[PDB]
Symmetry: C3
Subunit: 136 residues, 3 copies
Amino acid sequence: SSLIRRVISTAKAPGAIGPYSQAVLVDRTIYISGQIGMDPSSGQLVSGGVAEEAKQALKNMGEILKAAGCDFTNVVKTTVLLADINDFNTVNEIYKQYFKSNFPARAAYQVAALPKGSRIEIEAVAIQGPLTTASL
Amino acid sequence: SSLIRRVISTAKAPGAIGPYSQAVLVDRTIYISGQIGMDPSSGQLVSGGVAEEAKQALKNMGEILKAAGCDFTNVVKTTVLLADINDFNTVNEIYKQYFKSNFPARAAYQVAALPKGSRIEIEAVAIQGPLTTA
Amino acid sequence: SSLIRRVISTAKAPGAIGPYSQAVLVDRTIYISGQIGMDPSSGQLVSGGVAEEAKQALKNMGEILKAAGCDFTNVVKTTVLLADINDFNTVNEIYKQYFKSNFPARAAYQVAALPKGSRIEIEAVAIQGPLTTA
């Protein structure tokens, strides 16, 4: 009757440094922490604003997915939090470079402020494969 | 070992204005995108403010639920995102016309802005039936 | 084939002041509503500000978890919604009084406004154990 729950941690994404995990896996469902454009090495936000931060946040998410045996095709839901709702056109273009098709469900909105003054934070839910459309 | 994962897509609700699906069904859990009060025919927000937008957003969610085999009773969690926290009474009154009992868990708060200048966005998680309640 | 959906209800946490349930359990997953620093017996926010409200909100979350046969170790994801981003450190130190290892995944950010003028709201997803690593 037990289920495995394991905390994902990879050095290719910025480390926790706090009472949170990069992501938690529990019977094929992966809850991924909100990712911002932090460089895993420098511990600082990359420079350049939303375009550069979005790219970095998505790479960070990709490395976490990888450590769980997944890729972007496994993501079923994201939340995209913005410092400015008007950055959507830019953000969408970058988002589509990682999420190429069969897009996750999504919620999206502008918040009042994000950690470290970032312009974007992306959280996600993913499911460990293998996956099928067939009702079997 | 395979789990069923399928996108839900109905013309009864608005087409995506960005790279997202209306909902994703995965092993009985349905993740529904944030819905706003956009008319499915025109692709524009309905006129009249928060009360009319909330209604349309819920109708849109309802059509997505239907296409996933589900109705409002299958919803287990929602997030209500408001342009103005003072609209809560108005929003709840409308919310209760759709969700009538065994209510979903819920988070609610005011955000800075929503897509298309909407006054409300509602996301949800539902579970595909059969479901039997204690 | 049929999954049971159970609404979690306990007088040890504040009763709902809107159309929502404290938490909903379905097939092992427990979706917990956003908790604020309200005292169950008065149904009013505690005094003292964010520090006091955060402790109360977590305490309310703990009672809801216990009512579902869980504790804080069962939590796999939280969202911390702040009225002020600068309250983060204060809230984080309190959060660590409850979560001690195998930490939940997390999102944190500042919103425009929370219900009843609250300085913090915390929602969560938890999974019914036993949960193991092996």
